[PDB]
Design a binder for this molecule. Structure first.
Ligand SMILES: *[C@@H]1O[C@H](CO)[C@@H](O)[C@H](O)[C@H]1NC(C)=O
Ligand SMILES: *[C@@H]1O[C@H](CO)[C@@H](O)[C@H](O)[C@H]1NC(C)=O
Ligand SMILES: [Ca+2]
Ligand SMILES: [Ca+2]
Ligand SMILES: [Ca+2]
Ligand SMILES: [Ca+2]
Ligand SMILES: [Ca+2]
Ligand SMILES: [Ca+2]
Lengths: 276, 276
């Protein structure tokens, strides 16, 4: 029915007595997904050989050779456990004991203990899986984002809430989120300047303009586009303030989309109005 | 069927918007046995009052008042969470939000996250539960002992393997385990000096003698007794070398028992032989 927590004890054959010659032991330990295995030795004493060729206790996790332990104390070519802690790479860990044909001294083998352990994905690896807040739990983790933001479909990146602010004043200011700091990733901002009939809106790119532009592809990454009831403008990208735009419309919509990477600082617009 | 891992998110009513007046919220979070709850705030902003009387977020674990959180920053009489981490005392934790009748400023409440977590009984508390080796695992722990020792019935203390060494030489030395260091707890040592018919064994308490003795009860704690086929000797306890014992036997048995506490260094005996 319900599965017991994974933990146990591994020893050399006949422990605490001496271990024999021509012996082989192997254990394949497996934790649930989201869990890894913690292993350590309370006792260790084997035959010393170059690269631990003769007798050895090897720890592997799939293809990765985690350890090859021999002797009593570590050398420049051989390693002894001591009270060090060994962790599996993933939920799996294989432990193998081997002895050759002879043992000059009565080497007394090993005693080691293991237990399943929750992987803390929030502290593992400077390569944070979460854009804003990381939340760890037994056998998993998830991301959240701060105020004015929402968790993206990818369950990691945090998109800004920068859509649906309607401007109705004769003049005002628009800007990418966090301006003049780098605008957030995978965000879709929608600005709507709606004025009464008889007015014309004018847009002025002020201060700074830094939307991600890469060579001979124009703006396939981040895109700043302008739409009126008469025409379209954009996509505007680059590092130079775009020229003044005198729309002959009382309603103007500005859309700003971003990709998955970049530290570009964005844009800022001052809009004004004139009468007929 | 199978129970999901315990984790979740708790917020003030209407979060991220302002929280209202005359509101009350309560959550009783419970982890499995051997697990505790980890709680932290990503957001916190409440009304400040003396000892957080008006509005508050209180954290309790049974009877223990873990926290009473108010305001924005901590004072000398009030506390704000910040990015501090709060742990439950046991598998249970109650979280209570309360607001009074009025809020002068638009206080915007809180956002907090929680998750179940394995209690590490081996690192918790200088009051180690295990005598020798402590081994932690998900939802529990157990003890083991080093070589020459075995785990006692109490699953914690480690008794010495000091029984059944037969002496057959004309002379030799006996001693409490780890002598001249403090003898182990809850141990039962049995020494057997067996010689051929025609010999008489003599016992000499040498060097030092320190068996736990407490006033006017003689030796009810640790007991060193001697048995021959003619009589008995002991129990010997105290801080003075006991007098020489000339047994008229070729077989002598010495039994040494210990209790659950003490740093007494024990005893050492030199036995010899004479002919008829
Ligand atoms: C661990 O530490 C103890 C105490 O320092 C030492 O006696 C022992 O050799 C070390 N290594 C192992 C494998 O126990
Ligand atoms: C946590 O730390 C951040 C960054 O220093 C800070 O802005 C915030 O006020 C702190 N407290 C909470 C509850 O987030
Ligand atoms: Ca060998
Ligand atoms: Ca996890
Ligand atoms: Ca970008
Ligand atoms: Ca209030
Ligand atoms: Ca535990
Ligand atoms: Ca004692």
């Amino acid at each position: 029915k319900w599965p017991e927590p994974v933990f146990g004890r591994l020893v050399s054959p006949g422990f605490p007595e001496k271990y024999g010659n021509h012996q082989d032991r192997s254990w394949t330990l497996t934790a649930p997904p989201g869990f890894r295995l913690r292993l350590y030795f309370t006792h260790f004493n084997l035959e010393l050989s170059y690269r631990c060729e003769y007798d050895f206790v090897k720890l592997t996790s799939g293809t990765k050779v985690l350890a090859t332990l021999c002797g009593q104390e570590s050398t420049d070519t051989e390693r002894a456990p001591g009270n060090d802690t060994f962790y599996s790479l993933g939920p799996s860990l294989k432990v193998t004991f081997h002895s050759d044909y002879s043992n000059e001294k009565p080497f007394t083998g090993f005693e080691a203990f293991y237990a399943a352990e929750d992987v803390d994905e929030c502290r593992t690896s400077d390569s944070v899986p979460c854009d804003h807040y990381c939340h760890n739990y037994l056998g998993g983790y998830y991301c959240s984002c701060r105020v004015g933001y929402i968790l993206h479909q990818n369950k990691h990146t945090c998109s800004a809430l920068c859509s649906g602010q309607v401007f109705t004043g004769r003049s005002g200011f628009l800007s990418s989120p966090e301006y003049p700091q780098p605008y957030p990733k995978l965000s879709s901002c929608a600005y709507n300047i709606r004025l009464e009939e008889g007015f014309s809106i004018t847009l002025d790119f002020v201060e700074s303009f830094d939307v991600e532009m890469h060579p001979e592809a124009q703006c396939p990454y981040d895109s700043l586009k302008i739409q009126t009831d008469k025409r379209e403008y954009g996509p505007f990208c680059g590092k130079t303030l775009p020229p003044r735009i005198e729309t002959d419309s009382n309603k103007v919509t500005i859309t700003f989309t971003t990709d998955e990477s970049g530290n570009h600082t964005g844009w800022k617009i001052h809009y004004t109005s004139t009468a007929q």
